[PDB]
Structure 1
Amino acid sequence: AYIPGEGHNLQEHSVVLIRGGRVKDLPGVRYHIVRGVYDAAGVKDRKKSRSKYGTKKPKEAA
């Protein structure tokens, strides 16, 4: 299981949501991780791929 890229913590449980999709990297990359799940909740500050990259609605209060 890979991950959704930048901004991780994960340590060793997380419930990494086995997903699915290799690339030209890590002879596997099948069954990814999701953030949000039971751990990770995305990049500390993300402004796009918040469909996996955790972050809710950047409510910058202004």
Structure 2
Amino acid sequence: PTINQLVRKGREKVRKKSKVPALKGAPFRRGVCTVVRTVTPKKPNSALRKVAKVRLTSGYEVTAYIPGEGHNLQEHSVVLIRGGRVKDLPGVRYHIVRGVYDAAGVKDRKKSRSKYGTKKPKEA
């Protein structure tokens, strides 16, 4: 555009949209499980991913992924949300943190223990 046009209208700043409306930007947010279930992925995958509909304190009702080999969440578990998508499950934009609240870590896991929140086992 002409400089006069630029003088006249200027440029428009690029606003970014959040992919994690867990309000207050907040690094994490806690909620209660409303429904614990299984969902099937989209092409080209197949399985029974574990999801949970969480009622957040931010006043939101979003579905969250339950990472890990196995869990212990029912229709009343209080858990902490983390925020992280699951490529295969459209609509799942957050992860449930394992190791906090009613969400047990994952026993037996020995490698990426930090995530999945599993205490270091003693080696005798």
TM-score between both structures, scaled by the size of structure 1 = 0.74
**Structure 1 residue 10: Cα displacement:** 0.9
Deviations along 1:5-59, one digit per CA (max 9) or x if unpaired, are: 2120111233232211213212122121011110233212111222221210111
* Number of residue pairs the alignment of both structures matches: 61
> Rg larger in 1 or in 2?
2
* Distance (whole Å) between structure 2 residues aligned to residue 23 and residue 47 of structure 1: 23
Please list every run of 5 or more consecutive structure 2 residues that lacks an aligned counterpart in the other structure. 1-63
Question: Is the 8 Å Cα contact of residues 7 and 42 (structure 1) preserved in structure 2?
Answer: no
* Structure 1 moving runs of 4+ over 4 Å: none
Question: Is the 8 Å Cα contact of residues 72 and 104 (structure 2) preserved in structure 1?
Answer: no
Residue 75 of structure 2 is aligned to residue 12 of structure 1 = yes
Question: Is the 8 Å Cα contact of residues 79 and 103 (structure 2) preserved in structure 1?
Answer: no
The structure carrying a bigger strand percent of its residues is 2
Structure ranking higher on relative contact order (CA contacts 8 Å, 6+ apart) = 1
Question: Is the 8 Å Cα contact of residues 2 and 29 (structure 1) preserved in structure 2?
Answer: yes
- Sequence identity percentage: 100
Name the counterpart of 1:46.
109
Question: Is the 8 Å Cα contact of residues 17 and 31 (structure 1) preserved in structure 2?
Answer: no
Q: Report the aligned-residue RMSD.
A: 1.7
